[PDB]
Amino acid sequence: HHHHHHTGWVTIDGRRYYFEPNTAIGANGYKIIDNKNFYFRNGLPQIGVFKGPNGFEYFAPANTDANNIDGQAIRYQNRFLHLLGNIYYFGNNSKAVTGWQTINGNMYYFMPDTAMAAAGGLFEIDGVIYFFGVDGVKAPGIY
Amino acid sequence: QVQLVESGGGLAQAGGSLRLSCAASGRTFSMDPMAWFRQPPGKEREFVAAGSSTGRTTYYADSVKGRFTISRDNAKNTVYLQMNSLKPEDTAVYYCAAAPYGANWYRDEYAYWGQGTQVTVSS
């Protein structure tokens, strides 16, 4: 295997990994550890927007809000997140919105599986084709 | 703890060139768009340029299109503004910015702002 047996939090090559105490293999999926939320792949906290058991959270780079560490979910309220070329909108509960949304008078569609805005072309949603701008805003009309 | 620091400003003659650098520290910006804004005397802050996380996709104010070029080096956590064919109209305090939280990158809503560097162009 790629890793030897470790348990709990360990530092490897400049990153903190979490290994399951009962199996000594890297953690996978969402976990709250000491009141900090992470989304793991093979022990390594992932950085980005991922779906946890109460919706999409922003698992942020270190020092984004309240001195969070790499991959720790952060408070992120009532604003857009423009990450890696993709567009999200976060509500008052610090979760990314999904489906049809009206924001500042404009209509968006946030993909249910990724929370990313449909953007930059024609998208088929529930049998109907719509046009979305590069900014994720739905144009007038049917296509 | 996070700082954006502009350098490369100052005086220049019309038709000439300047290169601004904005060095970021305290947090990695490789996932965020980065931008330049400017504030002319008496007027409000205005959009100049913005570049995507990798640097592949760029947007420019109509005023500066063709003359100004935005680029970035993520290994250095730095964004640049190459200012060619300078005009007296370009005279302004220039600000670098990162991580927009408004609807689009043109809007003056960014999570991090530089201190600003004075640029003066003479006729």
From TrEMBL, chain A:
- Entry's family note: Belongs to the clostridial glucosylating toxin (LCGT) family.
Positions of the Cell wall-binding repeats?
7-25, 97-116
The molecule here is called TcdA
Origin organism of this chain?
A: Clostridioides difficile
Q: Where in the cell is it found?
A: Host cell membrane; Host cytoplasm, Host cytosol; Host endosome membrane; Secreted
